[PDB]
Scaffold this motif. Structure first.
Motif, PDB file in Angstrom:
ATOM      1  N   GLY A   1      23.667  19.780  35.373  1.00 19.42           N
ATOM      2  CA  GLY A   1      22.565  18.953  34.932  1.00 19.42           C
ATOM      3  C   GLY A   1      22.122  17.904  35.920  1.00 19.42           C
ATOM      4  O   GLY A   1      21.539  16.895  35.507  1.00 19.42           O
ATOM      5  N   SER A   2      22.375  18.104  37.206  1.00 21.03           N
ATOM      6  CA  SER A   2      21.969  17.159  38.230  1.00 21.03           C
ATOM      7  C   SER A   2      20.580  17.502  38.750  1.00 21.03           C
ATOM      8  O   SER A   2      20.075  18.611  38.562  1.00 21.03           O
ATOM      9  CB  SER A   2      22.970  17.154  39.384  1.00 21.03           C
TER      10      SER A   2
ATOM     11  N   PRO B   1      19.210  17.405  42.263  1.00 22.81           N
ATOM     12  CA  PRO B   1      19.312  17.223  43.714  1.00 22.81           C
ATOM     13  C   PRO B   1      17.943  17.058  44.353  1.00 22.81           C
ATOM     14  O   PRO B   1      16.900  17.308  43.746  1.00 22.81           O
ATOM     15  CB  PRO B   1      20.004  18.503  44.190  1.00 22.81           C
TER      16      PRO B   1
ATOM     17  N   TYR C   1      12.651  24.493  43.272  1.00 22.41           N
ATOM     18  CA  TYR C   1      12.299  23.084  43.224  1.00 22.41           C
ATOM     19  C   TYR C   1      10.873  22.900  43.718  1.00 22.41           C
ATOM     20  O   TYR C   1      10.388  23.665  44.555  1.00 22.41           O
ATOM     21  CB  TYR C   1      13.262  22.238  44.071  1.00 22.41           C
TER      22      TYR C   1
ATOM     23  N   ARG D   1      14.876  23.354  39.281  1.00 25.27           N
ATOM     24  CA  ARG D   1      15.256  24.551  38.529  1.00 25.27           C
ATOM     25  C   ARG D   1      14.116  25.057  37.652  1.00 25.27           C
ATOM     26  O   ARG D   1      14.347  25.589  36.563  1.00 25.27           O
ATOM     27  CB  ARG D   1      16.518  24.312  37.699  1.00 25.27           C
TER      28      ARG D   1
ATOM     29  N   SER E   1      13.071  12.514  37.064  1.00 31.83           N
ATOM     30  CA  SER E   1      12.996  11.179  36.492  1.00 31.83           C
ATOM     31  C   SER E   1      11.886  10.372  37.154  1.00 31.83           C
ATOM     32  O   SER E   1      11.733  10.381  38.377  1.00 31.83           O
ATOM     33  CB  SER E   1      14.335  10.461  36.646  1.00 31.83           C
TER      34      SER E   1
ATOM     35  N   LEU F   1      29.248  20.572  27.401  1.00 32.35           N
ATOM     36  CA  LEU F   1      29.968  19.450  27.985  1.00 32.35           C
ATOM     37  C   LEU F   1      30.776  18.744  26.906  1.00 32.35           C
ATOM     38  O   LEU F   1      30.326  18.618  25.765  1.00 32.35           O
ATOM     39  CB  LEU F   1      29.004  18.461  28.640  1.00 32.35           C
TER      40      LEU F   1
ATOM     41  N   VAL G   1      32.571  17.071  35.395  1.00 32.06           N
ATOM     42  CA  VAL G   1      31.280  16.528  35.793  1.00 32.06           C
ATOM     43  C   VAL G   1      31.404  15.056  36.171  1.00 32.06           C
ATOM     44  O   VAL G   1      30.721  14.587  37.087  1.00 32.06           O
ATOM     45  CB  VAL G   1      30.253  16.745  34.670  1.00 32.06           C
TER      46      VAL G   1
ATOM     47  N   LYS H   1      23.308   9.230  32.813  1.00 33.03           N
ATOM     48  CA  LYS H   1      22.078   9.495  33.555  1.00 33.03           C
ATOM     49  C   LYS H   1      21.555   8.174  34.098  1.00 33.03           C
ATOM     50  O   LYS H   1      20.945   7.388  33.372  1.00 33.03           O
ATOM     51  CB  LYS H   1      21.044  10.173  32.666  1.00 33.03           C
TER      52      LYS H   1
ATOM     53  N   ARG I   1      20.408   6.016  38.123  1.00 30.54           N
ATOM     54  CA  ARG I   1      20.379   5.976  39.574  1.00 30.54           C
ATOM     55  C   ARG I   1      21.769   5.616  40.093  1.00 30.54           C
ATOM     56  O   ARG I   1      22.697   5.341  39.326  1.00 30.54           O
ATOM     57  CB  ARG I   1      19.334   4.976  40.061  1.00 30.54           C
TER      58      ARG I   1
ATOM     59  N   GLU J   1      24.509  27.389  43.425  1.00 30.72           N
ATOM     60  CA  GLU J   1      24.622  25.940  43.510  1.00 30.72           C
ATOM     61  C   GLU J   1      25.895  25.430  42.855  1.00 30.72           C
ATOM     62  O   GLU J   1      26.208  24.242  42.972  1.00 30.72           O
ATOM     63  CB  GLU J   1      23.402  25.280  42.856  1.00 30.72           C
TER      64      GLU J   1
END
Ligand SMILES: CCC(=O)N(c1ccccc1)[C@@]1(C(=O)OC)CCN(CCc2ccccc2)C[C@H]1C
Lengths: 232, 53, 336, 281, 217
Positions: A103-104, A106, A160, A176, A182, C65, C86, C123, C125, E4
């Motif tokens: 869920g990142s 990049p 992306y 994705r 964000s 998760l 994670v 979530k 920065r 990934e």
């Protein structure tokens, strides 16, 4: 968050130069960092990548051997020791950030970039319409076809979408193929499937001018697209 | 003291509850449990094609 | 003190009113339904990242998760499909006895012997998990704090008190004070308007997150209620106590429907959870193994014996695809 | 006369009992204990080394029985290197466990830093490579020589042999019998001297019983080491220093002493695993 | 496979290495558990060392890192959290000797010791029993006889006898006099030898733990 690079200027061909990207404002030690260059009037191009802890390094097929990349975690600095430059390396070099977990997002934050000038099997993304006109309020539909089905067996189709406004660095819009980044307005929305992607913009607004690149992150080396530019 | 009075008020407020007969309540418990017997991957094991673990 | 004479007659009236509503039993009604047979669930994953004894866990609404707390000061966020970690959030106090996962996924929480369950930001920065708030104000160990939404959270501490918090503010907007023993568990209704909570006086209650008044009060155990879990319909809830007996209660009839007890079971329950449909009653015991009670006929269906120490936590995914158990063995199995 | 079949039988029975012991210990470690403590890693490594060492007795026994080495030239090097390498690494892990216990009992606050499973594996691989420092040269100098009326697998050295062939025996005697005996007896004597003055084993009768059983265990393991390894070393020293006339007694005594040297590798599970307190569970 | 997810596996392995590295730092530390009845000298022993539910107190003596958990700030059921402190290295116990004539509080401390000594979790966990306020016990032993809290006292009302009587009355509460030890020390504000006594008891406990680990014990 801040990523400032330094070490740009005129360099004779065959010489050497070191580019330093000094991060300030985030946990640099936990992000994998990239280097992405952009010719004066061409699209983006991938160069190198270090992971968190420097346990994995990849280069492109043009800078393998010539360029070497390294990071300094205690000093929050990213280095690209360039050797044996050519007349093709003249490009703005961007320092890109990328963290990898479930869920990142990049490639989220891109640096500012140097202005390096040197005097004289992969996946191919294809953006056919290199430049189209557009008026505010209208809906645009940018397409990007890959040379290989990006949809992986786990369900994640790695594709992306970046936007490089004139005078700035490219920012992340879609990661994705479905997920909004964000701070990106809800006007953007990515669609498509394997080998056929699209970026639909609804109720277009100002500050959307620029070039739209489509990077694939299925396997290294990562490849960008030609880039569709929107004219007013 | 206020403890006993508050307990009495709480027990009073617990009395004016519209009770449901245990027959109808148990029938409803059995009705919700039977209508969802298909959407329950633990009752009947599913094949390895749709099971992510 | 003649006011106590009202309390005795009131208790007798309560016991008589529910006695008149006890026409039949849940055993007689479900005596004409086919049983579930032997439910053999084998281990699919083993999450080996904790060094001390695991004390709690909670799945995410993504049903992939899961967070987990243990006494070594770590709050790891696993990825159950691939056993990947994670995050690994180091706690300022290694005595953590509960943890939660926000429904959206932007936060977690964990409390313990420090009277504070603190909200962590996922979530954000800077790519690091950072403590958003530290909710202080209780006067006893925190046994369970669950997330209503991203901005509210209900707790339950060892000072015989449950409280509803406001994360952005940090003040208890509503405090539920009706218990006589310390609260040991908690479970939110599917619509997140009511919730039940165990105690150490063998009495679980039913509160309202908006009003704050004790709606009903259920009893019938002989020891401290350790766990609790709402029925997926929202009109019943099971319990777990130290008398080695689970029992499905009922919010409508205001009384227990049946009791899940076995003669060869003498250890207390530490964890209770239902299934997606509501037929299974996963119960974790101190016998190092988790039993599986058919929640309609009260017959033991199967056994989940894969742990080397007391099972302290238990959760079923929001889609019913897996059952995660976490023991003092420091390992966090995931059955299916 | 026909003592060869009896000698081969002795070799085979000690080989099979040692192999069964080591493999049982390895099975229990990999199955139940899960190998998460330093002592468990040490015991697993010792069992592995002992098993791989005693697995070479079939070859030597058939070689002594048939008077030939029909296993070729690669198997000769492999077997002899395994033999020497494994003797050295088993003895070195014995000394490592002895020093581990000595540090654990006599230097607690400093054993809190050195007795970790990661450090256990580090010292394990260090012992493996340090014994490879001897297992590799013997692999390099092993060949299949041809005798008058038979074939044999032995070692070969350069000229003069009077200063190169005895070098191997001197190194084996010093680095595998003198240093190990000395280090294990020093560490265990100091450990018992310290254990004689802990409050957990001095006050009551049961605590004195525990101290007595610990002292008995230490004395038994040291005495087993000394009784099993000393005969063959003194024997090879005498044979290299005195040309004893080869008779019907010298051969059987030599082979019985080699069997007495291998029964330590066979018996190490009994002393370190089967009578280990957290192993009987 | 793992397009990934290779970098995700790498991040998982990196934070797993960080977990293993932070778990060895917390294994070389000695954790205690400072118990004791109310109004005891337990607030002074924390100051005799180097130094809102429970308050950890980290200090180091002779290259040994101590963590002392004071759990007195929880007036709730000890039955429901006393298993969190299982596996602790030792249990310090502060008992005020000058409370034998105040209020039967000495019997309260005695029953508390009997409960947290014969607990099902602290069977093998040693106890470092301290006896604070020895000076006040001196000043109040000549006038206030021991017959108040212990009427069955058959002996002289002197310090060397009554103090030893209290010591053996406290030490005679464990039914496992073979497996667990009780190190007693008539502490005071004198010469701050308490840290050395705790270091000695903790060293004995560490030797016993190492013996259990290496399979000897
Ligand atoms: C002093 C130790 C010693 O020396 N030994 C030895 C080693 C371990 C235990 C007992 C004795 C050996 C010995 O007896 O040498 C005199 C043992 C015999 N192997 C021969 C290897 C071989 C021979 C024929 C075919 C295949 C392999 C050599 C030494 C290791």
């Amino acid at each position: 968050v801040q990523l400032v690079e330094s070490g740009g200027g005129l360099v004779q061909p065959g010489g050497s130069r070191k580019l330093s990207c000094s991060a300030s404002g985030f946990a640099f030690s936990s992000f994998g960092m990239h280097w992405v260059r952009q010719a004066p009037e061409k699209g983006l191009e991938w160069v190198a990548y270090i992971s968190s802890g420097s346990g994995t390094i990849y280069y492109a097929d043009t800078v393998k051997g010539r360029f070497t990349i390294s990071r300094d975690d205690p000093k929050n600095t990213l280095f690209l020791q360039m050797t044996s430059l050519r007349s093709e390396d003249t490009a703005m070099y961007y320092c890109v950030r990328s963290i990898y977990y479930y869920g990142s997002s990049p490639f989220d934050f891109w640096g500012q970039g140097t202005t390096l000038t040197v005097s004289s099997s992969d996946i191919v993304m294809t953006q056919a319409t290199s430049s189209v006109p557009v008026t505010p309020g209208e809906s645009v539909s940018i397409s990007c076809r890959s040379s290989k089905s990006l949809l992986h067996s786990n369900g994640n189709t790695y594709l992306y979408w970046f936007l490089q406004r004139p005078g700035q660095s490219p920012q992340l819009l879609i990661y994705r193929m479905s997920n909004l980044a964000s701070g990106v307005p809800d006007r953007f929305s990515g669609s498509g499937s394997g080998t056929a992607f699209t970026l639909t913009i609804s109720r277009l607004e100002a500050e959307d001018v620029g070039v739209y690149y489509c990077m694939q992150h299925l396997e290294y080396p990562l490849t960008f697209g030609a880039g569709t530019k929107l004219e007013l | 003291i206020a403890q006993a009075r508050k307990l009495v008020e709480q027990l009073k407020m617990e009395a004016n509850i519209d009770r449901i007969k245990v027959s109808k309540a148990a029938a409803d418990l059995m009705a919700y449990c039977e209508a969802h017997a298909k959407e329950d991957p633990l009752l009947t094991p599913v094949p390895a094609s749709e099971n992510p673990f | 003190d003649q006011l106590r004479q009202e309390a005795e007659q009131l208790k007798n009236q309560i016991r008589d009113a529910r006695k008149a509503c006890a026409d039949a039993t849940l055993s007689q009604i479900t005596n004409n339904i086919d049983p579930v047979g032997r439910i053999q669930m084998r281990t699919r994953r083993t999450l080996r990242g904790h060094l001390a004894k695991i004390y709690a866990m909670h799945w995410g609404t993504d049903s992939r998760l899961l967070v987990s707390a243990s006494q070594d000061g770590k709050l790891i966020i696993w990825d159950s499909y691939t056993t990947n970690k994670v995050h690994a959030i180091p706690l300022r106090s290694s005595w953590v006895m509960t943890c939660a996962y926000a429904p959206s996924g932007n936060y977690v929480a964990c409390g313990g012997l420090d009277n504070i369950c603190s909200i962590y930001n996922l979530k954000t920065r800077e790519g690091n998990v950072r403590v958003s708030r530290e909710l202080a104000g209780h006067t006893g160990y925190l046994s369970c704090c669950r997330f209503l939404d991203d901005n509210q959270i209900v707790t339950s501490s060892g000072d015989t008190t449950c409280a509803l918090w406001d994360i952005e503010t940090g003040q208890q907007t509503t405090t539920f004070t009706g218990h006589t023993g310390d609260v040991m568990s908690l479970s939110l209704a599917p619509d997140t308007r009511l919730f039940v909570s165990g105690a150490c006086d063998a009495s679980a209650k039913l509160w309202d997150v908006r009003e704050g008044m004790c709606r009903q009060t259920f009893t019938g155990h002989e020891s401290d209620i350790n766990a609790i879990c709402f029925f997926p319909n929202g009109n019943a809830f099971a319990t777990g106590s130290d008398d080695a007996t689970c029992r499905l209660f009922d919010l409508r009839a205001d009384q227990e429907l049946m009791t899940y007890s076995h003669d060869n079971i003498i250890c207390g329950i530490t964890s209770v959870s239902f299934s997606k449909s509501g037929r299974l009653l996963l119960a974790g015991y101190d016998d190092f193994n988790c039993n599986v009670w058919d929640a309609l006929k009260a017959d033991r269906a199967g056994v989940l014996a894969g742990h080397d120490n007391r099972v302290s936590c238990l959760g079923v995914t929001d889609d019913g695809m897996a059952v995660a158990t976490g023991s003092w063995d420091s390992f966090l199995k995931i059955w299916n | 006369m026909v003592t060869a079949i009896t000698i081969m039988a002795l070799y085979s029975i000690v080989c099979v009992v040692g192999l069964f012991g080591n493999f049982l210990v390895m099975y229990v470690i990999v199955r139940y204990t899960k190998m998460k403590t330093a002592t468990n890693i040490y015991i697993f490594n010792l069992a592995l080394a002992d098993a791989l060492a005693t697995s070479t007795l079939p070859f030597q026994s058939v070689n002594y029985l048939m008077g030939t080495w029909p296993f070729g030239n690669i198997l000769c090097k492999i077997v002899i290197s395994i033999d020497y390498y494994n003797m050295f690494t088993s003895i070195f892990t014995l000394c490592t466990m002895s020093v581990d216990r000595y540090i654990a009992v006599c230097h607690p606050v400093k054993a809190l830093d050195f007795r970790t499973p990661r450090n256990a594996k580090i010292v394990n691989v260090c012992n493996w490579i340090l014994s490879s420092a001897i297992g590799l040269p013997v692999m390099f100098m092993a060949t299949t020589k041809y005798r008058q009326g038979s074939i044999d697998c032995t070692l070969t050295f350069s000229h003069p042999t009077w200063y190169w062939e005895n070098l191997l025996k001197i190194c084996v005697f010093i680095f595998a019998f003198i240093m190990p005996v000395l280090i294990i007896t020093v560490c265990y004597g100091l450990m018992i001297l310290r254990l004689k003055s802990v409050r957990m084993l001095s006050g009551s009768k049961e605590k004195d019983r525990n101290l007595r059983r610990i002292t008995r265990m230490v004395l038994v393991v040291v005495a087993v080491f000394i009784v099993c390894w000393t005969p063959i070393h003194i024997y090879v020293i005498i044979k290299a220093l005195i040309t004893i006339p080869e008779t019907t007694f010298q051969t059987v005594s030599w082979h019985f002493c080699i069997a007495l040297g291998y029964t330590n590798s066979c018996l190490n599970p009994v002393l370190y695993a089967f009578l280990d307190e957290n192993f009987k569970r | 496979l793992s397009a990934e997810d290779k970098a995700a596996v790498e991040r998982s392995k990196m934070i797993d290495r960080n977990l293993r590295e932070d778990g060895e730092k917390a294994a070389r530390e000695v954790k205690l558990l400072l118990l004791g009845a109310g109004e005891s000298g337990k607030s002074t022993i924390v100051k005799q060392m180097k130094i809102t539910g429970i308050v950890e107190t980290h200090f180091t003596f002779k290259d040994l890192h101590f963590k002392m958990f004071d759990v007195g700030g929880q007036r709730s059921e000890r039955k429901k959290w006393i298993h969190c402190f299982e596996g602790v290295t030792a249990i310090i116990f502060c008992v005020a000797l000058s409370d034998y004539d105040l209020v039967n509080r000495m019997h309260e401390s005695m029953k508390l010791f009997d409960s947290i000594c014969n607990n099902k979790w602290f069977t093998d966990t040693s106890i470092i029993l301290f006896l604070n306020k020895k000076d006040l016990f001196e000043e109040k032993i000549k006038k206030s006889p021991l017959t108040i809290c212990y009427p069955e006292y058959a002996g002289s009302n002197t310090y060397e006898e009554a103090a030893a009587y209290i010591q053996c009355q406290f030490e005679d509460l464990n039914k496992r006099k073979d497996t667990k030890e009780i190190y007693t020390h008539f502490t005071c504000a004198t010469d701050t030898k308490n840290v050395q006594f705790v270091f000695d008891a903790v060293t004995d406990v560490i030797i016993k733990n190492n013996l259990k680990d290496c399979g000897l014990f």
